[PDB]
Amino acid sequence: MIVKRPVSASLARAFFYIVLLSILSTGIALLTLASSLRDAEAINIAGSLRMQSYRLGYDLQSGSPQLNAHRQLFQQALHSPVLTNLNVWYVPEAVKTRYAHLNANWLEMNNRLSKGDLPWYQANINNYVNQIDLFVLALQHYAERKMLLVVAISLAGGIGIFTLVFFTLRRIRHQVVAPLNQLVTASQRIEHGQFDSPPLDTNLPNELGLLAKTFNQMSSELHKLY
């Protein structure tokens, strides 16, 4: 008699899949959250561009001396680190393309502003800011996507951990714990000469199967010299 399916290997496998699942789900979730940390900041700055744009029209009409300073503030906001860090592989085409339209469009706006072309501004500002609005919408959706993905994985892993634990403990109980109790009871019984006790099930392919057999064999005999 050999042991065909050592317990050592079964557990290795079981606990490994519990682990791997834990690392995989935590790895993706944490990557996604790392990439999402500045989403709120991103949406705020991109939106501000809409206020800044209408503010520029207001400064034009009123002859404000802050026009040029407001014109630089817009430039600086548009090319702020958080928005330039959107040109990067894991960000979708829609966000990156809408962003590129806002840079082109600005070049025409800023220019027209330096020629103080107010009729132009009045005709174009609705369309101009709309384009900004769609950019911020795209960022809003992308933030929502990433967060949903995290909810999927949090909920998949926490379900998959509950599953794997359940079946692993279940298998341990039926193939190790229950049979060990039978062995112990049988050991305790023969030790006080109880001998008409039904023999152990030997059909486990692990160590408990081999011990059952040894036990039944050592016990059928030593019961009979007796």
Next chain:
Amino acid sequence: MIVKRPVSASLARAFFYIVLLSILSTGIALLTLASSLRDAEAINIAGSLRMQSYRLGYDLQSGSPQLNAHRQLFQQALHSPVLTNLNVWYVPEAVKTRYAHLNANWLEMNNRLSKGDLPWYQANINNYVNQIDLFVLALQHYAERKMLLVVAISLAGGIGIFTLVFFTLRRIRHQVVAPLNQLVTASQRIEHGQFDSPPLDTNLPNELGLLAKTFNQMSSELHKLY
């Protein structure tokens, strides 16, 4: 001889704490993410109020016929579901209070607008929109907090699962798997009359300790009639 620390109870406890930790960390993470699903939307709408406010000044100066429609659009945005659902226990005082200032302030703005008081608007718009700006900042920070909290728990649970698994498998190996292999080897050896083999360690408080003793006892004797 009794079994002082049944394996059944040890595992119950071990796998339970693996589970509980999984549920607790997933429960908090999923609550936090549920409450965070509309954070991006919230920040976008709140920001839009800044554009809308400057747009109203622009319509005042230009005599636009959209002033009143733009005035309702602001009202509707300010009292949109996503912003009114901020008056709720799990949202901090700072967000809820800044929101309340924006409702008061609007009442003065909207009124002054219906008296087309343009000098008033020019004096107050900087301060007015600033107050909106601080509200959106507060929302931005709160979104960032919640997300950091989720990162803490994702990373605490995924570490705590790796810890508990590690010690549980470790304990199983030393108290169940290693001793079972000794039993099997010992069983296999006496079955082919090897008998000067060193006796099993009996110092485990579980079933393996009792079996070791039974084995050593049944083996010291049956070795000697021989």
